[PDB]
Structure 1
């Protein structure tokens, strides 16, 4: 249990070919995407987004990977800011595996919306959060606004966007913006523990819950994900197989043989 949860982690490198990020995977199922541009507090540029999309797609399709971690190189910044990033936001959202934001230092502007899109956020004590749109003539009125309101509520979301202040780790925790705050030195340790707890659980259940939680926000786009999971489940049932069996066996499909539950 605990000892297993805190066992060391061996990161296998998969960064070959990438320029702005590092991409790594552990034997037990964690993929980590790290923004590697600390000279600029890990702000992203178009290439960085293109690379993260590629890396996240890789994780999605790697059947040994169960959880993805998003983080920034170093301890001073997760991501200080930036529009292909809209694609990336959708990709995080629709990923059937949990994505955890591991935040040390600055998570600001587009970088702040990135951590919010992640299913969970594990913050270090030196973490700082905030938006900058209105101070620099910009804004994210998509998930950056509505989804934030679903995390911290309408009063706080309006404060965050309208004033563009910075919030420390404690403030973030108190408003329910991050899931937990740990000392900088234990950030990886704690983040890896949370991932491992999720890895012990049913991947199909996580996938359906994530779609279900998205469906409270995304209208039909959410229904598409939720119903897609239902369809996938249905193919794995006897009645769902009677269809293909109808072909192979070459005959009329017979569902009269199947039961009808209330």
Structure 2
């Protein structure tokens, strides 16, 4: 399959495997993505989801161009495609566990949307980023405009979206589009896999609350904080600390 899930204990990988079209997404792939997220989310052992190319190279060149051109006069297709992309983007960005995009090549348009929906991004030296709807007279979904502005601010967001020009790995790192430069996700994934999954999931939800406009602590966020002390992970943390050993979460 051109989009598949691999589950390897604490780590799952969402793999994009369509090298002959530079990992371009078709409508069926967009529709499939939420199903794979649901499969991954149902695994209690999972600690981190990695999104990456199955074969290195391009991360995702964006829209399937043959599909775009074949359906350029098809209103039903455009509506279905809009909904599928928006669903996929919405769900990926709110996946319960930490998510990492490993970008080793071109990450364009809808591909950039996928990367933006992950919690953090690692860029290898060949990585390139761009958002190109202005080159076809199209718009970017507001959900994804917000993901972009959240990371790089409105100046860089407009620079990228108005021009549709590509930027390289170092510039993406400089402007905050990617958090890390590196050849592999292994080191980061190792760190993410060993911490408390109670903590990561709760903190992830707090960050989302802040991004959705929450300004101060309220009764619920105070309760979530306090609930940690009743949890098994806190008991493992304190027990491990007393025994001078690493906690095993």
Q: State TM-score, norm by structure 2.
A: 0.77
Relative to structure 1, the CA distance from residue 230 to residue 51 in structure 2 (aligned partners, 3 Å threshold; closer, same or farther) is: farther
Relative to structure 1, the CA distance from residue 165 to residue 232 in structure 2 (aligned partners, 3 Å threshold; closer, same or farther) is: same
- Name the residue aligned to 2:199: 205
- Name the residue aligned to 1:215: 209
Matched, 1:26 2:20: no
- Name the residue aligned to 1:91: 91
Kept in 2, the 8 Å contact 1:129–1:168? The answer is yes
Aligned equivalents of 1:228, 1:63: Cα separation in 2: 24
Aligned with 2:33: secondary structure? helix
Aligned with 2:211: secondary structure? coil
1:56 Cα deviation after fit:
1.2
Kept in 2, the 8 Å contact 1:72–1:78? The answer is yes
Q: Which has the higher contact order (CA 8 A, sep 6+)?
A: 2
Aligned equivalents of 1:228, 1:57: Cα separation in 2: 26
Structure number with bigger Rg: 1
- Name the residue aligned to 2:239: none
Structure 2, gaps ≥5 residues long: 64-81, 232-249
- Name the residue aligned to 1:141: 141
Relative to structure 1, the CA distance from residue 101 to residue 219 in structure 2 (aligned partners, 3 Å threshold; closer, same or farther) is: same
Matched, 1:172 2:172: yes
- Name the residue aligned to 2:188: 194
Relative to structure 1, the CA distance from residue 235 to residue 164 in structure 2 (aligned partners, 3 Å threshold; closer, same or farther) is: closer
Relative to structure 1, the CA distance from residue 235 to residue 71 in structure 2 (aligned partners, 3 Å threshold; closer, same or farther) is: closer
Kept in 2, the 8 Å contact 1:33–1:71? The answer is yes
Aligned length: 210
Matched, 1:50 2:46: no
Relative to structure 1, the CA distance from residue 45 to residue 175 in structure 2 (aligned partners, 3 Å threshold; closer, same or farther) is: same
Relative to structure 1, the CA distance from residue 233 to residue 142 in structure 2 (aligned partners, 3 Å threshold; closer, same or farther) is: farther
Q: For each residue in 1:92-140, what CA deviation from the matched residue of structure 2 results, as whole angstroms up to 9, or x when unmatched?
A: 1221101100111010001101101100101110000010111112222
Kept in 2, the 8 Å contact 1:42–1:73? The answer is no
Aligned equivalents of 1:228, 1:95: Cα separation in 2: 19
- Name the residue aligned to 2:241: none
Aligned equivalents of 1:96, 1:230: Cα separation in 2: 19
Once structures 1 and 2 are overlaid, which stretch shifts more, 42-51 or 140-149? 140-149
Query: Where has structure 1 moved over 3 Å in runs of 4 or more?
Result: 226-238
Q: State TM-score, norm by structure 1.
A: 0.73
